[PDB]
Design a protein around this ligand. Structure first.
Ligand SMILES: N[C@@H](Cc1ccccc1)C(=O)O
Ligand SMILES: N[C@@H](Cc1ccccc1)C(=O)O
Ligand SMILES: N[C@@H](Cc1ccccc1)C(=O)O
Ligand SMILES: N[C@@H](Cc1ccccc1)C(=O)O
Ligand SMILES: [Mn+2]
Ligand SMILES: [Mn+2]
Ligand SMILES: [Mn+2]
Ligand SMILES: [Mn+2]
Lengths: 344, 344, 345, 345
């Protein structure tokens, strides 16, 4: 026999099964309540039963648990203060969808050693600490296996621009315990996200692993808590005209016309200093009408900007983020605007 | 103590591991020769060493292995006849990337019962029978787990238009033993596929299973045999102007400027009779110059058109296909056109 | 670091999990029915509910499935012929507990030294399924804690041999086996170890094995109330009335069942397959006199008598020596006659 | 539906955390690796006659409490260092006796019948890594074919007990253990099973178990050349000079090492801990006269003497009765005394 199997494979190493991580780090009664409740609260937002604004906000990527926990500590205070106008959940994303650093799960030690057992442990550990302190977590799931390791700790999931059209990621979302947001495509196709909600609301089958770590078929029940995310395209799509047009196509498709607006990425034009602009336009809509907005997303860290090496504490090494002060302003701006909308 | 795990899952059933299927249906020496050889031949096309045309052709999707075998039986004689001008490899795709029928792996019995162990068995059996008879096989990998069950029998793989931009599908491609084609986006975005080749040529790490069925981290070494597939979008992109523009961009990104043209899907605009037209243009191109074309894709079946239910034998239940007579003319057209290119 | 792990291991290779084999060879309706029934029928003998004699009879070891099947076709006739007097169940043991040479049909199914265990295990399940489907139940020895997951669903009666009867894990195993189990006395004739094994196996225990899916697992057992002793001699033969009587006394004293099995082969025969008949005559004389403590016998039998080092002749053992088919007819006819009279009392 | 045939007598089969999960949480350290590699080699030297120190396997009958066990180890480690030129001291870290009652530390770590085996295996590995880290090698008995994948990398010396020495699979296991292995004589004093065991264990075999990832597996061994017998009595003790001589003669006749270990406890003490000293005194007299064929002894010792049905008292056995710490010092001072003189010849 000529060889035909694993020709271009350096190594296939066994990973500790999810059950191993769940044994060391069982979810606590407290994290369980914060998760269950935040998910329900978000459901109400998706389906129009509450007019609070869901704010997904935090670092572009997590590369340092200390800074992440310190960021949460400061955010927790504002989560409480604006709890009547805003439902603040923290971005706990472990990589960018990219060339550069491959994320915290792949490369937890920031040196190129790919210790993914440790990476996954750290991600779970972080997510339980956060929930335990009272800060819910959100994340993007890039693949169909990692969710088994910590989705139990996640109160809101994203499927990014580059995966919203992928069948298997829609099948994933259809079984995720948390509400899920589908982003529009990298060039501004909103339809792919609309179809994804359709798909995600039905029952599907996809492949993954059991909690015990073995190949498996997953039969989902459908996810009725999905929604669109406006993150821009060739041009930005945050304004009232783009919101109104999205809302119409949503209704026509017979899915929720309540949606979320990313202030960052292509809606800012990859310029962190324009997130405030977007949030200001969103504030104007809320004060006017803004019936179709249920959430915003905001890339934010202790220190503003980007760096290639993790030199500065609390500075992103993936996309550029606004800093803490700009975070106080933006959140305040949104809370006040939405106080007025809810008051009508 | 609120539940948070698997809230929207009906069932997670463990699957027979790949080793089980590999025990019942080990790759034979002759299939192993055919695959090894065929990957290498295709790799020569991708890199400009051989001017024969790769022809990926066959059903939109396999819904009946018996008819698929009979198809292959007719195709093989054409493979042999045109072996100096065309390298003919059969489409063995088990699903459309969507609605309705979930494909042969999910739903092998065509009634709705989701017998996945059986479907995986049937897919491997069909692929081994095809190789053993001397017909190489091609397919699309939609997830990161199914390759372990039968990628060893695959001479060419596709990442489809809906997944080319997906990070995890790029990582997968980087570790596939076969050469891989990346389709352009559903709206015509060629860049996502050019970036995909760049991405897939490097080492990555993604999650999957071992042959024994255990969750695994897999370290790839890069796939140097990737290329682009022009597939249409808002308008078709098969003509010389589009081919020439794409070649420049490929050169600019420093990747192979030899590409593949799908005669079906958004180039035929879902009209199966127009695939013959696309081939005509392609043939006229090759006759003038056609330096940048290394293959084409055709959707072809025993009988033409499509049907919703599998009533008629060898007739598609997914995208409509040209029938056997049109397939003969198309392949003769392409053989003759490329005979003249090669003779220059 | 210095190394400390796997220092004396040439390789550890993965095996197909039990489910892969149970997928290919699912137990049939009629195989299920035969297994259940037979286990129940044997239980009744263990516990004095029925006076039929269990006869565990067949090759010392299976080295050729085709031979095994032809053997089963002939025995089947007699199983049916003598169904009112004898419960005939075939021996399907895949190795002798050795000590250098052929390591059995599971380990070495090709009989050339390759160790294709995936294949052996499939072949063994395949044979046990075909035997049951034809109306012949099967018996075997389980040497380890993992093999029973592959084919115990096809076994109507199992043995724990002389060399493992005292082993704590083998007793815990037996406590979780679905079939009734016979515990052999020690190689030097020690009966107490088998008496203790009955009491031990009746309780609930825990041991390590694999799930059907092939992963490390803890097995919490329910207890096996259908165990009994097997007299197989040792320093001296223990098939006669006097030995049977001393054993029954010790068994009653421990509060376990005083119904036992007698091996006519191995050390009771002194490794001479022609003495198997003599032992059966003795057992038959006992059954005629009284023999109330006997529920079964064991007999090593094959198409062709004797043994051989290489598998040259069809139907002849390459492990212990067996009586041939003619002698089998005598033996079974003899025991059926002696027990017919017992059951008439 | 079919008649049922599968797991009729099973309460449950719960899947287990795989060895890799414990190996991740508790990886062997560089210093523990050195001690294990070095101690294994030193013991091999003792087995093959290259060093004349006495291997002393000493410690509790069974470990029911790691705190007590760690304290016992700190005390023993002093005498390990003190007597290093005369005795090779290694701690007994047995997790159960091969038995109904308490099922051991691995099976039932919480001593209350809850059977939390993931925790038990976690605890056993932890204690063993802590012992090697403080500088005290560890010995244990392997009762099955699976547990070793969880912590054998931390064992410097292995026992196969009296009740398993004759078992085919246990001998096959032994042939793949990274550590040296002592085989005990049978519960009735049969020495031959142990001598056969050494022979068997020195060759390559194939037995079934699990990969480190927990998957059903076939294990191919390279043989264990470092095996020896352990004399632990029978119907009568077998520690004296005469029994030692006759054993050495049979060992030589079989072509295997005539160097042996004497267990001072169990059937050599007549199951009476007060007699372990008697046995140790005789062995000492032998070492002073000649004692050439003795390479080790086994002593059942704990912080406090005797035993108890329930774990009320700290550092007192709940399995076999042990000598207390005072006696332990007395016994070790004696052996070091006797062997200093033997080594000086
Ligand atoms: N555990 C995930 C669902 C899931 C199951 C299996 C595979 C992947 C995802 C959740 O609760 O959301
Ligand atoms: N076995 C695949 C590569 C692969 C390994 C593991 C997971 C996914 C893909 C091949 O030969 O192409
Ligand atoms: N499946 C075996 C019992 C068993 C379970 C698990 C391990 C070993 C044996 C039977 O039914 O007899
Ligand atoms: N890991 C054991 C050997 C072993 C392997 C596999 C199963 C059982 C035992 C050792 O180092 O000694
Ligand atoms: Mn970002
Ligand atoms: Mn198609
Ligand atoms: Mn025999
Ligand atoms: Mn003891």
């Amino acid at each position: 026999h000529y060889p035909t199997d694993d020709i271009k494979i350096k190594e296939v190493k066994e990973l500790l099964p999810p059950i191993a991580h769940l044994y060391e780090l069982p979810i606590s009664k407290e994290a369980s309540g914060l998760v269950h409740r935040t998910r329900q609260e978000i459901s109400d937002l998706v389906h129009g039963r509450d007019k609070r604004l869901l704010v997904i906000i935090g670092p572009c990527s997590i590369h340092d648990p200390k800074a992440a926990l310190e960021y949460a500590e400061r955010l927790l205070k504002l989560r409480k203060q604006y709890e009547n106008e805003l439902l603040i959940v923290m971005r706990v994303y472990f990589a960018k969808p990219r060339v550069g650093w491959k994320g915290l799960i792949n490369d937890p030690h920031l040196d190129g050693t790919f210790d993914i057992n440790f990476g996954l442990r750290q991600a779970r550990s972080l997510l339980l600490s956060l929930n335990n302190m009272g800060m819910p977590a959100s994340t993007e799931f890039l693949d169909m296996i990692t969710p088994q390791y910590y989705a139990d700790l996640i109160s809101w999931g994203a499927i990014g621009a580059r995966t919203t059209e992928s069948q298997v990621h829609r099948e994933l979302a259809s079984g995720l315990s948390c509400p899920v947001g589908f982003k529009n495509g990298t060039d501004g196709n909103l339809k792919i996200a609309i179809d994804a909600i359709g798909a995600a609301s039905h029952s599907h089958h996809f492949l993954s692993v059991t909690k015990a770590g073995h190949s498996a078929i997953v039969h989902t029940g459908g996810n009725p808590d999905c929604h669109v995310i406006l993150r821009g395209g060739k041009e930005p799509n945050y304004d009232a005209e783009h919101v109104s047009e999205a809302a119409e196509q949503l209704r026509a498709a017979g899915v929720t016309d309540k949606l979320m607006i990313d202030c960052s990425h292509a809606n800012s034009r990859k310029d962190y200093t324009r997130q405030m602009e977007v949030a200001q336009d969103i504030a104007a809509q809320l004060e006017q009408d803004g019936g179709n907005i249920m959430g915003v997303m905001v890339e934010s860290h202790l220190v503003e900007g980007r760096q290639d090496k993790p030199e500065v504490y609390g500075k992103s090494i993936t996309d550029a983020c606004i800093g803490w002060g700009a975070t106080e302003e933006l959140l305040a701006l949104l809370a006040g605007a939405n106080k007025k909308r809810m008051a009508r």
